[PDB]
Design a protein around this nucleic acid. Structure first.
Ligand SMILES: [Zn+2]
Ligand SMILES: [Zn+2]
Lengths: 115, 69, 304, 64, 44, 98
RNA sequence: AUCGAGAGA
């Protein structure tokens, strides 16, 4: 089973306002425990195993001056299939704001599912 | 997709026979029954695994993101 | 009455064939409850070695990591199960695997295009390098003291030409599988037999004599080698009932429905043990019988 | 002590639509070792109008 | 080189405050690459 | 440990008893049942697995007297070991001969 | 939160 979500970081800002959050880590005292799932650019490694409550993305917020992470919100664990970096089509060269993260779910046939 | 290494029903290893089956079909004008017999697949449970394999990995492999196309 | 002495007096074994993979032997005058115990132990109680834990380091191929690890686990190995002990799962993984219970394989194959490919060619072995990954590429890495114990016997798959994966240029697989002892009741990848079953000896009871043109078709209702014709009188008789698989083709004909009954010899079993490759079928049967005996002995010595 | 639901505890089952009171009974709890399906005897199929081709039913746990 | 272009499949590394685009061509979609990290499994 | 006596189904004199064995199945159950039914003194013997998903086996033995269900169980286990030994010996001899 | 498509018994 393949699941895809759009981690759109540019959903709070609107109409040319300055970039609020940047993918990555800040200089604050963020815990080092969540580096096992996130690459140095705040994005998840390909093929890593994520469960409930572990990081999916990491962005530093200037309106908060603190690094905030997202979280895999699903009871069923999955593996990171692919991470797509999408850049906006505008002629200006902005930062990274939209990243697509796909999950892979192992649907081993168990008791209860229909054949 | 890719040839199953072991037969489901019994467990006889049929994963090492897909390429030889294709060779027996291609080079010699052997039909599927004779080719399966010569490969050593006796039980129809073993015969179906190689007779009905689709080998979709060949079609999956043409979408290579690590190569200039 | 019944006694072990009487069973010994009435018990016989008729080994019909014996190869490095398949053994066909008979158990004569034994109980179904014991033959079935032997069959079940052969199928799902004899230990074997197969890949259990896989440590991927990179897999940029079409095959997903879990499918690749499962397919690696399904490969049979030419390893004698007696050369390593059982893993104590209670221990942490730091020292759970030791030099005497785990065999560490490895796979490092990287596909690149072949610049010398002939024009108009479609064969992946000429177009690409390492286009096909085979089980023979599972390189055995000796660890600790086992570099001396496995010196004479290398750890190679029973089938080395198993197609584990396919690749295209730029794609690489780099893993390291650990294979340990396990039984076929835990996972089907551990069962040391392809199939290990039995069957009752068929019985073909000819009631009324069949002679002439009728005996011609009566013979054809069976496999050719079972029913024969007596030289003196043109009768019909059972030459070899082992060569018969019960298809009851006779009972389809009203001509022979009233002249023969089909049955079995309820204490004559025809075993057929095909091994996956790790050990010989005769040793598999030996180990199944010894497992049943040791199970009974352990139960006896257990304090009730 | 908010202890788990043992074998002695009693549970109430229900399969919608609850067309009569027989479609909601109080069963005895038997904690099985395999997960993710409610095991029901064949006697209750007529009572619940239940089936085993994808049917599902609720399990209410009384607290006093 | 942690990223791969989605049209010309050329490895490229992005620094901070940098354009999210390929350099050899002008594609705006970048695929993340898979590095060498241990991913334990079970051969089940 | 592994073998368990179900005291709530055992006769006071020991003539009848019920046993629970963990990590066992039809394999040992049927063999033990067959080898115990050969005892001339046992009146009732049978095996039952309460639930398939659990690894528990139940053995019921009822002797006619002068013995015990435990003694019948021990005799059955010994006779099963002897049967396994004789079949192994005959198979070894046939393997050598061929 | 609302209205549209669909699915299970
Ligand atoms: Zn088969
Ligand atoms: Zn590009």
């Amino acid at each position: 089973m393949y699941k895809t979500e759009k981690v759109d970081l540019a959903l709070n800002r609107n109409r040319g306002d300055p970039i609020t959050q940047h993918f990555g880590f800040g200089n604050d005292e963020w815990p080092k425990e969540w580096l096992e799932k996130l690459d140095e650019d705040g994005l998840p490694y390909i093929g890593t195993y994520v469960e409930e409550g572990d990081p999916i993305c990491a962005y530093f917020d200037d309106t908060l001056n603190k690094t905030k992470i997202k979280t895999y919100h699903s009871s069923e664990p999955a593996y990171i299939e692919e991470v797509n970096l999408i850049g906006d089509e505008s002629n200006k060269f902005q930062e990274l704001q939209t990243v697509s993260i796909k999950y892979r779910i192992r649907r081993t046939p168990q008791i209860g599912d229909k054949f | 997709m890719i040839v199953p290494v072991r037969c489901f029903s019994c467990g006889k290893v049929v994963g090492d026979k897909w390429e030889s089956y294709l060779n027996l079909l291609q080079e010699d004008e052997l039909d599927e029954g004779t080719a399966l017999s010569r490969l050593g697949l006796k039980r129809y449970c073993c015969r179906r695994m190689i007779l009905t394999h689709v080998d979709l990995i060949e079609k999956f492999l043409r979408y290579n993101p690590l190569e200039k196309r | 009455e019944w006694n072990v002495e009487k069973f010994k007096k009435d018990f016989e074994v008729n080994i019909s064939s014996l190869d490095a993979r398949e053994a066909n032997f008979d158990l004569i005058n034994i109980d179904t409850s014991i033959a079935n115990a032997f069959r079940r132990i052969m199928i799902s109680e004899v230990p074997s070695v197969a890949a259990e834990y896989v440590y991927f380091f990179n897999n940029t191929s079409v095959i997903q990591d879990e499918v690749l690890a499962h397919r690696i686990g399904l490969v049979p190995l030419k390893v004698d199960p007696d050369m390593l002990t059982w893993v104590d799962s209670n221990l942490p993984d730091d020292e759970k695997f030791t030099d005497e219970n785990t065999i560490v394989l490895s796979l490092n194959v990287k596909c690149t295009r072949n610049p010398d490919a002939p024009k108009g060619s479609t064969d992946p072995k000429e177009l690409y390098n390492n286009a096909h990954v085979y089980a023979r590429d599972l390189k055995f890495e000796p660890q600790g003291r086992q570099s001396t114990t496995f010196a004479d016997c290398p750890v190679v798959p029973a089938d080395p030409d198993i197609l584990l994966a396919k690749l295209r240029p730029g794609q690489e697989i780099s893993l390291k599988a650990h294979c340990i002892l396990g039984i076929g009741g835990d996972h089907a990848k551990f069962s040391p037999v392809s199939t290990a079953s039995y069957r009752l000896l068929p019985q073909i009871n000819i009631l009324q004599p069949i002679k002439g043109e009728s005996a011609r078709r009566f013979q054809k209702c069976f496999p050719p080698g079972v029913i024969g014709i007596d030289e003196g009188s043109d009768e019909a008789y059972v030459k070899d009932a082992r060569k018969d698989t019960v298809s009851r083709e006779v009972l389809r004909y009203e001509e022979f429905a009233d002249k023969v009954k089909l049955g079995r010899v309820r204490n004559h079993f025809i075993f057929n043990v095909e091994s996956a490759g790790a050990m010989t079928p005769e040793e598999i049967f030996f180990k199944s019988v010894r497992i049943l005996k040791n199970k009974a002995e352990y139960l006896k010595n257990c304090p009730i | 002590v908010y202890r788990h639901i043992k074998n002695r505890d009693v549970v109430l089952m229900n399969r919608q639509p609850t067309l009569h009171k027989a479609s909601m009974m109080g069963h005895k709890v038997r904690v099985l070792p395999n997960e993710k399906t409610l095991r029901l005897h064949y006697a209750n199929t007529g009572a619940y109008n239940a089936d085993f081709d994808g049917d599902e039913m609720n399990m209410h746990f009384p607290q006093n | 080189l942690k990223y791969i272009c989605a049209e010309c499949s050329s490895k490229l590394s992005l620094s901070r405050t940098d354009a999210v685009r390929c350099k050899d061509c002008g594609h705006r979609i970048l695929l993340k690459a898979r590095t060498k990290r241990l991913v334990q499994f079970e051969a089940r | 440990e592994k073998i368990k006596l179900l005291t709530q189904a055992t006769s006071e004199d020991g003539t009848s008893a019920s046993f629970q064995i963990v990590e066992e199945d039809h394999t040992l159950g049927n063999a033990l049942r067959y080898v115990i039914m050969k005892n001339p003194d046992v009146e009732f013997c049978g095996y039952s697995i309460p639930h398939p998903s659990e690894n528990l086996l139940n053995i019921r033995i009822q002797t006619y007297g002068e013995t015990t269900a435990v003694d019948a169980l021990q005799k059955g286990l010994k006779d099963l070991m002897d049967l396994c030994d004789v079949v192994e010996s005959k198979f070894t001899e046939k393997i050598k001969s061929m």
